[PDB]
Design a protein around this motif. Structure first.
Motif, PDB file in Angstrom:
ATOM      1  N   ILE A 227     -49.281 -48.030  20.777  1.00  0.00           N
ATOM      2  CA  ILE A 227     -48.755 -49.342  21.263  1.00  0.00           C
ATOM      3  C   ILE A 227     -49.242 -50.330  20.335  1.00  0.00           C
TER       4      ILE A 227
ATOM      5  N   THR B 109     -44.589 -56.744  22.670  1.00  0.00           N
ATOM      6  CA  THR B 109     -45.307 -55.496  23.273  1.00  0.00           C
ATOM      7  C   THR B 109     -44.149 -54.475  22.959  1.00  0.00           C
TER       8      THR B 109
ATOM      9  N   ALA C  99     -43.847 -50.070  22.907  1.00  0.00           N
ATOM     10  CA  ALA C  99     -44.422 -48.891  23.004  1.00  0.00           C
ATOM     11  C   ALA C  99     -43.436 -47.541  22.347  1.00  0.00           C
TER      12      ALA C  99
END
Lengths: 288, 48, 48, 48
Positions: free
Chosen positions: A106, A125, A127
């Protein structure tokens, strides 16, 4: 301790077998500035250890802070880094956080800065786990006053991919919404399920006049076992022009299931001359 | 369709009368102001 | 101004100015207003 | 659309009611309906 200022230095070394603990703290006092550094490393094994490093510097009208720590457990890893610069009315915060276990990792990005008394913020962000990506982005320049919002949320997978994009502004007087959503649904449990998503929403507002329109198409085809061809095709679109002198609206609802369909046509009217509505309920049905 | 009432007419009449009277009073005030010159006021102040 | 004033004309003028203000607000542009604000800030800084 | 306010004077304004009418149509081979219901104002004269 001297007229120059206090000095404090301490070192504590301890180790046996796989364990080694090297700790040192350097505290110096000089005039109107402070210098400090604590470099601490705790090794339990080559791939199993902890690292901490804190470094603070105080000087007239400026602050500098550095924070770097590292943790590892062979198959697992975690790292984090945060920068902090502060001076009168100017703020600059940035750094990185990253956690990973084998391929599954991540990535996070954070950067907050304030200039001209306006606060800027950006975060990213992403992932990537088991061959599936998620990309949600909160974009830059969320001022906090007379602000604006932008976003980009994206999910990607074999059965489903989802893309969402939004933009709006909260300026003093005028309002705007630009919402656009797209989703393709593919699923095979008990036959193929083609979940298609077309959702668009737009809204604009201003003093003494409001308007909007929703534009959605909903179609899903289910090729279930037992040669069942089921198609759910919902289509609704909305709109209405609003202002004190003239007011009206429209709503087109088209719904059908296989060979059975219903469609209603609605138009709402409210104006100086007249008020009235018109409805056309048309149905198509099977079975005796 | 316009709806007018005798109350509106009396309101307008009294409004006009009051405005006329206040204009007369304002003209009286202006004439009184012009009547006594500022330089004569300063002269009286200097005498005092 | 007292002579000019009349109730019907007063309300008519108020409605006119209100309609003008509504037209100005609905056509309000944030970029132009921001540039005007920058101009005013620069004016204040130059003054002081 | 832009804002629209009819002018304002000392008088009151009223758009008189003219008519009300209901139009209904039902189409189905089982049954057919066509019902109309209409009612309006008597605008021949104000006194009546």
């Amino acid at each position: 301790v001297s007229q120059e200022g206090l000095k404090l230095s301490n070192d504590m070394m301890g180790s046996y077998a796989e364990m080694k603990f090297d700790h040192t703290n350097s505290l110096n006092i000089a005039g109107l500035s402070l210098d400090f550094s604590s470099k601490l490393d705790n090794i339990y094994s080559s791939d199993k250890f902890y690292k901490q490093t804190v470094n603070l510097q105080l000087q007239p009208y400026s602050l500098v802070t550095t924070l770097n720590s590292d943790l590892k457990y062979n198959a697992l890893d975690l790292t984090n880094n945060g920068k902090l610069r502060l001076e009168p009315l100017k703020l600059h915060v940035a750094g990185n956080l990253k956690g990973a276990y084998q391929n599954n990792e991540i990535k996070h990005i954070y950067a907050i800065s304030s200039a001209a008394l306006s606060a800027s913020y950006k975060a990213d962000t992403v992932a990537k786990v088991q061959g599936v990506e998620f990309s949600h982005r909160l974009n830059t320049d969320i001022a906090g006053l007379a602000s604006a919002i932008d976003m980009s949320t994206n999910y990607n997978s074999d059965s489903l991919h989802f893309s969402n994009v939004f933009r709006s502004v909260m300026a003093p007087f005028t309002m705007t919404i630009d919402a656009h959503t797209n989703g393709n649904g593919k699923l095979a449990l008990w036959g193929e399920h083609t979940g298609q998503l077309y959702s668009k929403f737009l809204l604009k507002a201003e003093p003494l006049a409001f308007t909007f329109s929703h534009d959605y198409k909903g179609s899903t085809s289910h090729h279930l076992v037992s040669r069942k061809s089921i198609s759910a095709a919902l289509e609704h679109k909305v709109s209405a022009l609003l202002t004190p002198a003239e007011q009206t609206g429209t709503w087109k609802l088209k719904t059908q299931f296989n060979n059975n369909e219903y469609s209603q046509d609605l138009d709402a009217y409210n104006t100086k001359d007249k008020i009235g509505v018109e409805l056309t309920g048309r149905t198509l049905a099977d079975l005796t | 369709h316009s709806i007018n009432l005798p109350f509106f007419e009396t309101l307008q009449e009294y409004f006009e009368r009051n405005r006329q009277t206040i204009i007369v009073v304002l003209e009286n005030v202006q004439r009184n102001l012009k009547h006594i010159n500022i330089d004569q006021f300063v002269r009286k102040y200097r005498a005092a | 101004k007292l002579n000019e004033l009349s109730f019907k004309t007063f309300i008519e003028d108020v409605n006119k100015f209100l309609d003008m203000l509504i037209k100005k607000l609905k056509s309000f542009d944030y970029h132009q207003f921001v540039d005007e604000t920058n101009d005013k800030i620069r004016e204040v800084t130059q003054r002081l | 659309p832009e804002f629209q306010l009819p002018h304002i004077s000392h008088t009151i304004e009223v758009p008189t009611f003219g008519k009300l009418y209901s139009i209904l149509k039902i189409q189905s081979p089982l049954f057919t309906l066509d019902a109309n219901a209409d009612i309006g104002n008597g605008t021949t004269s104000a006194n009546e």
